[PDB]
Write an enzyme that holds these catalytic residues in place. Structure first.
Site, PDB file in Angstrom:
ATOM      1  CE  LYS A   1       5.228 -12.366   0.097  1.00 48.98           C
ATOM      2  NZ  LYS A   1       5.293 -11.377   1.415  1.00 48.98           N
TER       3      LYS A   1
ATOM      4  CB  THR B   1       4.234  -2.649   3.429  1.00 45.77           C
ATOM      5  OG1 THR B   1       5.291  -3.267   2.518  1.00 45.77           O
ATOM      6  CG2 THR B   1       4.797  -2.319   4.782  1.00 45.77           C
TER       7      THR B   1
ATOM      8  CE  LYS C   1       0.665 -11.218  -0.481  1.00 44.85           C
ATOM      9  NZ  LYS C   1       0.298  -9.938  -0.054  1.00 44.85           N
ATOM     10  NE  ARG C   2      10.075 -11.558  -5.642  1.00 47.15           N
ATOM     11  CZ  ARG C   2      11.307 -11.624  -5.598  1.00 47.15           C
ATOM     12  NH1 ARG C   2      11.994 -10.478  -5.333  1.00 47.15           N
ATOM     13  NH2 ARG C   2      12.312 -12.513  -5.987  1.00 47.15           N
TER      14      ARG C   2
ATOM     15  CG  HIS D   1      12.611  -6.846   7.841  1.00 50.96           C
ATOM     16  ND1 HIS D   1      11.797  -6.044   7.739  1.00 50.96           N
ATOM     17  CD2 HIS D   1      13.860  -6.230   8.059  1.00 50.96           C
ATOM     18  CE1 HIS D   1      12.511  -4.522   7.545  1.00 50.96           C
ATOM     19  NE2 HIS D   1      13.612  -4.927   8.038  1.00 50.96           N
TER      20      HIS D   1
ATOM     21  CE  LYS E   1       3.035  -1.059  -0.342  1.00 52.73           C
ATOM     22  NZ  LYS E   1       3.873  -1.689  -1.659  1.00 52.73           N
TER      23      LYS E   1
HETATM   24  C1  LIG Z   1       4.576  -2.704  -1.241  1.00 56.79           C
HETATM   25  C2  LIG Z   1       5.330  -3.731  -2.276  1.00 56.79           C
HETATM   26  C3  LIG Z   1       5.656  -4.964  -2.193  1.00 56.79           C
HETATM   27  C4  LIG Z   1       5.440  -5.661  -0.544  1.00 56.79           C
HETATM   28  O1  LIG Z   1       3.945  -6.346  -0.580  1.00 56.79           O
HETATM   29  P1  LIG Z   1       3.346  -7.359   0.405  1.00 56.79           P
HETATM   30  O2  LIG Z   1       2.129  -7.834   0.138  1.00 56.79           O
HETATM   31  O3  LIG Z   1       3.806  -6.893   1.877  1.00 56.79           O
HETATM   32  O4  LIG Z   1       4.372  -8.591   0.138  1.00 56.79           O
HETATM   33  C5  LIG Z   1       6.353  -5.633  -2.824  1.00 56.79           C
HETATM   34  N1  LIG Z   1       6.664  -5.483  -4.087  1.00 56.79           N
HETATM   35  C6  LIG Z   1       6.240  -3.901  -4.406  1.00 56.79           C
HETATM   36  C7  LIG Z   1       6.561  -3.721  -5.657  1.00 56.79           C
HETATM   37  C8  LIG Z   1       5.441  -3.026  -3.449  1.00 56.79           C
HETATM   38  O5  LIG Z   1       5.108  -2.017  -3.877  1.00 56.79           O
END
Ligand SMILES: *Cc1c(COP(=O)(O)O)cnc(C)c1O
Ligand SMILES: O=c1[nH]cnc2c1ncn2[C@@H]1O[C@H](COP(=O)(O)O)[C@@H](O)[C@H]1O
Ligand SMILES: O=c1[nH]cnc2c1ncn2[C@@H]1O[C@H](COP(=O)(O)O)[C@@H](O)[C@H]1O
Ligand SMILES: *Cc1c(COP(=O)(O)O)cnc(C)c1O
Ligand SMILES: Cn1c(=O)c2c(ncn2C)n(C)c1=O
Ligand SMILES: Cn1c(=O)c2c(ncn2C)n(C)c1=O
Lengths: 814, 814
Positions: free
Chosen positions: A551, A653, A545-546, A354, A657
């Site tokens: 990032k 991911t 995101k985190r 990953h 979305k």
């Molecule tokens: C989809 C999702 C992530 C992943 O987001 P990235 O932008 O790929 O880091 C992290 N947290 C939650 C709550 C998610 O729905």
């Protein structure tokens, strides 16, 4: 109402009486004292009733037919709420909406009472949840196996602009979805020592901890398939944990049970704590006994057919101990010769990588494995011995290659490289995005790729269109279905047909209308639960995101401050209004990440109260970002920020979305961003910054942030604002760590992408000013996101790794 | 089949489909994989369904009518299994027996799967359970309040003749009877300090622990009344227990939750540990908030009517903190003046004393109360101040009386005498047997009795005829009902009518037949679950209760060894065969009690393998004696041993259980034994030994065991056998502590009652040889046990202490 199913006469009536049955008999309440929480539970129990029948026949079916079983091992499963998702997959949404309406209740109000199942940190845990849904939908005999933490990811609170962590007691009111299975409790061993006697080694004098399973149903999309997610809970034996003060002996049981108490809140970061190692072996040891038991029953003890009946997928290296554990069982207990056992193990195991950042790599100190799992260390040394002998035989005299490929790393303290272990004991290793997979072959695992090129593959991540479209954006799903039907929900590729409506006047108007409705609803929710207004007419610029350095939420911050400074320079000049929303959790020990959250809130303090700015610019920090919150913001976003440094985000991911929900993407050529732009056409994407090659060129040269500071006045102005306390009056030197880092130790060259980033941001503002064209570009993204459905990903794992054929065949009714 | 109710056509059919509903929907199982445990649960859930309807109307009723509420506070509730008891009180037994039979299952086999609710040590905890059943049966608006320990009394295992303790994980498979009520969670405070500001004191900087309630239904006997037993569980707040390492913070929550983890396994013994004190305040603090909340709603803030609406009964001194806690709330929070608050408190509180032995008395070190409950200590000092001022005013110049009556004891370490606190803050203090109550007035609480004679009362204990007759001895209940009907089940006095059948040839034959059937069933169970034969034709001599020095299991041992020695002297002389069964648990830290258990098993090792003895004498130790085991042995007993030293057993209740089930009693004039013999006629009782007065005469004189050793050769022979290792060959000095104690520090003068004890034992053997007369004496005991029903006791508490009128009125159907 929508295509949430039929609100049949007989079924709405049936639903209502069962709702009342549960409220009375299950909840033991009477309408006169029932609260919304009670009503949610009565409904949850009523809905759960509908899939037990299917759940039992599905499992019974697999026992009869006996197909190859897929075991997805992961220490994380970011599930979120499950009421609505269950109604959707069972086509119960409209019937329940009707019934509850007739009972005088608002379904949406009740859905909000459900606690999220936050047994995950972010991407990795959510991938696992999307995968489960897809495997059920594609009719695979798949099982999700993990740990039932009683405390999931902490709940984030912002106090004085700082993140405050607080326990996530998600089980406080109970979990109506799980089914405790105490009768299938298994024993797991720890410590002890190894005895080498006559015919084999024996793991002796071990401490026993019991693993109690809890099953949660995983319904496929309208096919009557309900798979199982088995989560292990730690329990102390009642003998030795007392039999070896009487009171103290009983109170000390909460030492063996601490194993499943809390999820480690680290995203893409490795912490070598013993409790973590214990969690990793616990899930592996218990799960494997279940896998073998099921196999021993099958239609069968020749383990030669084991790989024909079993496939275990490793979600990262966390469950990596499954390799030496499978060997231990086969060799020590079943008494298979090493070579036969190894052949079997390699053939049933597969590993998914990953990330490529070093700090995320699991390298366990030998002294830890030595004390906790003595026999496993011996097996790992032996695996290493035979593997290296293979290398030497392939690259005679390449002595450096030998040390580089070793599963054992020498130095300060000897460590075990779990990633090397996984490559050696798996028949397939895969990246999660095309570029990430290539990087693995060219860099990190180059030596391994040269040794066995056939092992390396790619499986681009995906997301489930059910939860990430039909569930969170029914409005958009409806208008799409009005034109092309409903078959796209389990066949996202069909979204392409939407290309022919790209010039359709009604569609353009509709697509734009649902996005406007979504923005109004979110803007409302904001004032409802968090309170302090935003303007729904502005551009919704969101990055959720985190919180990470890679990032680059910081790069987003630089842009926000720039927008602010330009407005203050020419106040009476028109600029497209924006509401920039940044959200995400910082791991508790990640100082920098927590410093970044404070910076964000600090910027908002200045920007949001400057009268000259007005409603043209708002900076908002989205609190407690989680799955249920994601289902709210994403459908309401216009601009999606995916700006990691090229080469650092394996796939991502969230980006997917947003693309599926009508938001445009401003990002770098990183992870899946590349395949998304490739799918929609770079002209319908806002790409900027360095490409991977540029990053490497800069590294050869040497990255010097001063240069950028010297040549860009706007950048310089920002850094001096941070340095002088413009954003922290009471504590002027508050952000010295951020500035210091940015100027002297920026591993992710934020300054290197600044100029191209704001330039590109100007281009999106230009396009937003042209509603009709912005929407047409949106349609080009949505219509082309089909490739990113987890059904595609799973179908690929199934055929290219597991050796099973997916099937969209409805199981024989419930 | 019996009078276990009607097996109606419609109801048996209804039962069967609900059994199947639960097996499928609740247990999520299919007939093909269902185990007996699953079947028990399907039935338990089906039966539980029948009383929720009644449970809801009962509680709703009390809310409408608003009667005086009775709150029974106790740290123990020895409930045992609840399936059968629920069927009995609901008249569902035959219907369920039929239905399950038709489903092809054996109800009795399923009932054995239910785990005991062992939240009690012995007598005290069982009294509370019997009281609950009676209060429900007499239609009182009563609530049982306690602690939901996740580990009840330990499970006893005998290894090598020694007791081994092991955790009682009674919740392992779940509890279908309880209903978690997380929505009524309350906060409880600990530590902190006291601030005296302007208008009152304030308890500040406290640590908060949450109390979560779990309600269990308590059905009355066939009257449709279902009361509630609320048990508190400790939970940590998610804020401060994290908000004041992140992982460690979460793992440390199991520190606040340790409060309800385990029951202290001490019977009639005080251990001043802080965790115990914490449990005592926890149950009190949480319970009182519930009592006041309910009162504030009522039909009403004048607390003048508080005592007219509330009554709180203290089961021993364990919940004694309720007195200073009620004052704290009224004075500190509600702002009532001291005097008004005190009047209210005294008028609603009542205390029940259970023993006179010093080692059982609760005397808490001041430094403990000082640190843990600072405000309560201040209130106790103030209560003491005003109370002593009352004494001085009543007995001017009696300076010694002052120090004697103080709630505060000076010395090594200052302590608080919880018993004195209870007498001062209660309007009624009661003993549990006539003699025990008199002793309280003449001895222990003499000074208090002189001060306020009106406070002291007596309430002779009792047992419930439902569980202790109809449930465990249906055979006997049937033949009784054949002659006098069924009205005696809730009117035990009616058993007197059985006196007229004392010469009835059929009855004598029947009474004797059921006892024979019970002995055969128990003798079978013995070989089934524990394995090693006994003779059902012998006299069943049983002594089952907690292992104590004051209960004199040792005196029983001396007799057993005597019987053995006489047989070995004249082997070919006829003696009535006996199977002497001794059972009971020893508290973990009670060395002597554990030594006694080893002695018992040691005797059995010699006696049971001596060929010359044959089947004429068997010594058996009944393992893990508990409620469910009691329901098995008692109905099968011929001789009941109640041989405590006169003046030490406050009342006892096991004695009553045996009398109602057709066993004859050999005992001393102690506790309720006196009222039992008085009720049946001393001629139908085997009384022996010193009376209380004789014990005191001996103490004036001085007890010297040597004397008895010197004058009784048979006794001497036994002691030398123990001393030389006759019963412990491998470890000859094994029992030196017992011998040493018996000869030099016997607080319970075992030797003083030896001669009269064996002499009396000879008389029962003589009567056993005459079946017809033994049975006629039995009929005289049973027919006269009516007085010992807890319905009588409760009716007395209700009228003479609580001020409420019992009622046998059926609540308006379910
Ligand atoms: C989809 C999702 C992530 C992943 O987001 P990235 O932008 O790929 O880091 C992290 N947290 C939650 C709550 C998610 O729905
Ligand atoms: O021995 C067996 N007899 C009949 N059915 C079985 C048996 N073992 C498993 N099953 C069925 O297979 C399902 C799968 O159980 P599993 O072992 O948890 O995978 C069970 O719920 C049963 O329906
Ligand atoms: O405010 C109220 N309105 C109507 N019924 C109530 C109310 N408060 C309590 N009740 C009823 O009284 C029962 C007693 O609840 P308790 O507070 O736990 O004693 C509840 O289950 C309800 O049936
Ligand atoms: C009734 C009972 C007791 C009390 O017995 P006594 O002989 O009064 O000490 C103790 N334990 C259990 C299991 C009981 O049923
Ligand atoms: C230095 N550091 C941390 O200390 C850290 C982290 N994630 C969690 N922690 C604690 N990351 C990503 C990181 O780079
Ligand atoms: C001395 N002692 C104990 O030490 C003891 C006890 N009950 C429990 N313990 C630990 N009793 C009744 C007792 O007399």
């Amino acid at each position: 109402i929508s295509v949430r199913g039929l609100a049949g006469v007989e079924n709405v009536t049936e639903l209502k009486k069962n709702f009342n049955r549960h409220l009375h008999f299950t909840l033991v309440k009477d309408r006169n004292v029932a609260t919304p929480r009670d009503y949610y539970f009565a409904l949850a129990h009523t809905v759960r009733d509908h899939l037990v029948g299917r759940w039992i026949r599905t499992q019974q079916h697999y026992y009869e037919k006996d197909p190859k079983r897929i075991y997805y091992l992961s220490l994380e499963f970011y599930m979120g709420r499950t009421l609505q998702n269950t109604m959707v997959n069972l086509a119960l949404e409209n019937a329940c909406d009707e019934a509850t309406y007739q009972l005088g209740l608002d379904m949406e109000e009740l859905e909000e009472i459900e606690e999220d199942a936050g047994l995950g940190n972010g991407g990795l845990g959510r991938l696992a949840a999307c995968f489960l849904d897809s495997m059920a939908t594609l009719g695979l005999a798949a099982y999700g196996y993990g740990i039932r933490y009683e405390f999931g990811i902490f709940n984030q609170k912002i106090c004085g602009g700082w993140q405050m962590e607080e326990a996530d007691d998600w089980l406080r009111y109970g979990n109506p979805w799980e089914k405790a299975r105490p009768e299938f409790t298994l024993p797991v061993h720890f410590y002890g020592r190894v005895e080498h006697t006559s015919q084999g080694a024996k793991w002796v004098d071990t401490q026993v901890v019991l693993a109690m399973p809890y099953d949660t149903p995983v319904p496929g999309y309208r096919n009557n398939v309900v798979n199982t997610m088995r989560l292990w809970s730690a329990k102390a034996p009642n003998d030795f944990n007392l039999k070896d003060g009487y009171i103290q002996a009983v109170l000390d049981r909460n030492l063996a049970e601490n194993i499943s108490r809390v999820l480690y809140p680290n995203d893409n970061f490795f912490e070598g704590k013993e409790l973590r190692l214990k969690q990793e072996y616990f899930v592996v040891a218990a799960t494997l006994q279940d896998i073998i038991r099921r196999f021993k029953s099958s239609k069968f003890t020749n383990f030669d057919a084991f790989p024909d009946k079993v496939a275990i997928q490793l979600n990262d290296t966390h469950p990596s101990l499954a390799i030496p554990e499978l060997m231990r069982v086969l060799v020590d207990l079943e008494r298979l010769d090493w070579d036969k056992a190894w052949e079997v193990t390699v053939k049933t195991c597969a590993y998914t990588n990953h990330t490529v950042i070093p700090e995320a790599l699991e390298r366990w100190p030998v002294h830890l494995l030595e004390t906790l799992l003595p026999r496993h260390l011996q097996i790992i040394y032996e695996i290493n011995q035979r593997f290296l002998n293979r290398v030497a035989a392939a690259f005679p005299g390449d002595v450096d290659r030998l040390r580089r490929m070793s599963l054992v790393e020498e130095g300060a303290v000897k460590r075990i490289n779990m990633a090397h272990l996984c490559i050696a004991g798996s028949h397939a290793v895969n990246g999660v995005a095309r570029i990430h997979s290539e990087i693995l072959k060219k860099t990190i695992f180059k030596d391994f790729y040269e040794l066995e090129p056939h092992k390396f593959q790619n499986k681009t991540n995906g997301i489930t269109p059910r939860r990430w479209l039909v569930l969170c954006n029914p409005g958009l799903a409806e208008i799409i279905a009005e034109r092309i039907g409903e078959e796209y929900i389990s066949d996202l590729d069909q979204l392409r047909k939407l290309l022919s409506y790209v010039d359709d006047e009604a569609f353009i108007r509709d697509v734009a209308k649902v996005k406007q409705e979504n923005k109004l609803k979110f803007a409302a929710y904001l004032e409802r639960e968090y309170k302090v207004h935003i303007n729904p007419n502005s551009l919704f610029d969101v990055q959720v995101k985190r919180i990470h350095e890679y990032k680059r939420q910081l790069l987003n911050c630089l842009h926000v401050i720039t927008l602010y400074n330009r407005i203050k320079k020419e106040p009476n000049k028109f600029v497209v209004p924006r509401t920039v929303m940044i959200g995400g959790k910082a791991a508790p020990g990640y100082h920098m990440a927590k410093m970044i959250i404070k910076l964000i809130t600090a910027i908002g303090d200045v920007v949001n109260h400057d009268p000259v700015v007005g409603d043209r610019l708002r900076v908002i920090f989205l609190e407690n970002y989680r799955v249920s919150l994601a289902e709210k913001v994403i459908p309401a976003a216009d601009l999606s920020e995916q700006i990691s440094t090229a080469g650092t985000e394996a796939s991502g991911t969230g980006n997917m979305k947003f693309m599926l929900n009508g938001a445009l993407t401003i990002g770098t050529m990183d992870g899946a961003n590349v395949e998304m732009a490739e799918e929609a056409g770079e002209e319908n994407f806002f790409i900027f910054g360095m490409r991977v090659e540029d990053v490497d060129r800069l590294d050869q040269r040497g990255y010097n942030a001063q240069e950028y500071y010297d040549r860009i006045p706007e950048l310089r102005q920002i850094i001096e604002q941070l340095s002088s306390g413009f954003f922290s009056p009471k504590q002027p030197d508050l952000f010295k760590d951020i500035v210091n880092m940015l100027m002297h130790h920026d591993r992710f060259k934020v300054f290197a992408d600044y100029e191209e980033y704001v330039k590109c941001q100007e281009r999106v503002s230009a396009l937003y000013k042209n509603p009709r064209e912005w929407t047409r570009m949106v349609i080009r993204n949505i219509a082309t996101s089909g490739k990113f459905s987890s059904d595609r990903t799973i179908a690929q794992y199934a055929r290219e790794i597991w050796g099973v054929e997916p099937s969209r065949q409805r199981l024989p009714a419930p």
